[PDB]
C-alpha cells in the first residue's frame, strides 16, 4: 500500500489535501518550489524523455544524476529504495498507468541487495483546464497503493501544488527535476544536453510508443532501439499548420509549454515523415543503438 507518516493513504483524495494534512509533505513542497532551477551539465547525466524509464544504483560508475524536463501535464516519478540506493526515474504522461507503475516496481524489486524502505516522489503538472494532471495523480496514487509492498510517499508536488499564474494563464512552477543517485537529493533542474538520439526517441513518443526502459545498469549501457511505429497520420498537414494550430492539437497544454516547443514539434514531425518505416532502416541487424559513458562523462557510441 501507499504510506504517509506511517499510516495508509485514504483514496480518493486531492494531493493538496494530502499535503496540507501531513507537515513533512508540506515542508518538502515548500523547499522544492523555492529552489532556483539548476542548470545540470551532461557529465554523468542520464536524461529521461517523456514516456521513458531509467533505473540504476549508486554502484554505477557512469551515472550520477537522473533527470527529466518539459513536464506540463505529465508527472516525473522517482522510486528509490533507501540503503541499496536503487533509483528509478520515469516521466509518466497518463498513457497507460496500469502498466507503467508495475514497470517501475519491477525495475526496483529486481535489486536483491531488510535495510531501508521504498520511497516514491511525484512532481509535475498544474491546474490545466483538461484535468490531465489531476487524473494522472489519481491514477498514480491508486496503482501505487494497490501494490503489496509498503511504499512511503515522501515528495508530492503536483497539480495545484505546482501551479503558478501570469496574467490569467496557468502553467507549472517545476518543469523538471534531477535526482543524485548517491545522495538521494531531488532538486529543480534544467538540462541543455539531453543525450543522444533525442529526435529519434521523441519521434517514438509522438508516434504512440509505450513506456520503455532505456538503460541497462549491469552493462552500464544506454540502449536506444530497435523502434517500429505506424506512419504518423497527416505529417505534412500538421507540418504546414501555424504554431498556434500545432500547440492546440499536438500538445496537452497549448499555453503552458516551455519556449521553442513548436520548434521541437516541427523537428520531430519532420523526422516521422523522413522515417515512416524505421525498424529495418535505423537499426542494422535489428540491434539497439548502444551508448556508454566515457572518461569525460559523455555518452559515446559503442
Amino acid at each position: 500500500p501507499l504510506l504517509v507518516e506511517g499510516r495508509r493513504v485514504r483514496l480518493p483524495q486531492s494531493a493538496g489535501d494530502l499535503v496540507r494534512a501531513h507537515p513533512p509533505l508540506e515542508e518538502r513542497a515548500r523547499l522544492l518550489r523555492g529552489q532556483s532551477v539548476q542548470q545540470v551539465g551532461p557529465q554523468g547525466l542520464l536524461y529521461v524523455q517523456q514516456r521513458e524509464l531509467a533505473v540504476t544504483s549508486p554502484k554505477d560508475g557512469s551515472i550520477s544524476i537522473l533527470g527529466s524536463d518539459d513536464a506540463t501535464t505529465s508527472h516525473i516519478v522517482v522510486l528509490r529504495h533507501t540503503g541499496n540506493g536503487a533509483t528509478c526515474l520515469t516521466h509518466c504522461d497518463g498513457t497507460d498507468t496500469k502498466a507503467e507503475v508495475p514497470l517501475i516496481m519491477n525495475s526496483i524489486k529486481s535489486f536483491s541487495d531488510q535495510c531501508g524502505r521504498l520511497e516514491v516522489h511525484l512532481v509535475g503538472g498544474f491546474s490545466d483546464d483538461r484535468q490531465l494532471s489531476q487524473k494522472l495523480t489519481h491514477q498514480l496514487l491508486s496503482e501505487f497503493d494497490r501494490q503489496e509492498d509498503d511504499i512511503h510517499l515522501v515528495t508530492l508536488c503536483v497539480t495545484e501544488l505546482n501551479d503558478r499564474e501570469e496574467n490569467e494563464n496557468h502553467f507549472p512552477v517545476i518543469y523538471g527535476i534531477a535526482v543524485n543517485i548517491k545522495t538521494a537529493e531531488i532538486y529543480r533542474a534544467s538540462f541543455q544536453d539531453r543525450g543522444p538520439e533525442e529526435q529519434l526517441r521523441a519521434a517514438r513518443t509522438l508516434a504512440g510508443g509505450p513506456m520503455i526502459s532505456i538503460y541497462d545498469a549491469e552493462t552500464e549501457q544506454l540502449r536506444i532501439g530497435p523502434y517500429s511505429w505506424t506512419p504518423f497520420p497527416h505529417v505534412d498537414f500538421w507540418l504546414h499548420q501555424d504554431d498556434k494550430q500545432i500547440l492546440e492539437n499536438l500538445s496537452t497544454s497549448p499555453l503552458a509549454e516551455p519556449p521553442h516547443f513548436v520548434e521541437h514539434i516541427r523537428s520531430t514531425l519532420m523526422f516521422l515523415k523522413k522515417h515512416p518505416s524505421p525498424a529495418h532502416t535505423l537499426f542494422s541487424g535489428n540491434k539497439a543503438l548502444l551508448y556508454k559513458k566515457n572518461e569525460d562523462g559523455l555518452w559515446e557510441k559503442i
Binding site: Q50, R51, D70, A71, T72, T73, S74, D93, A202, T205, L206, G208, N249, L250, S251, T252, S253
Partner: peptide, 4 residues
C-alpha cells in the same frame, strides 16, 4: 507534453 506530446498529445495523443
Amino acid at each position: 507534453n506530446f498529445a495523443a
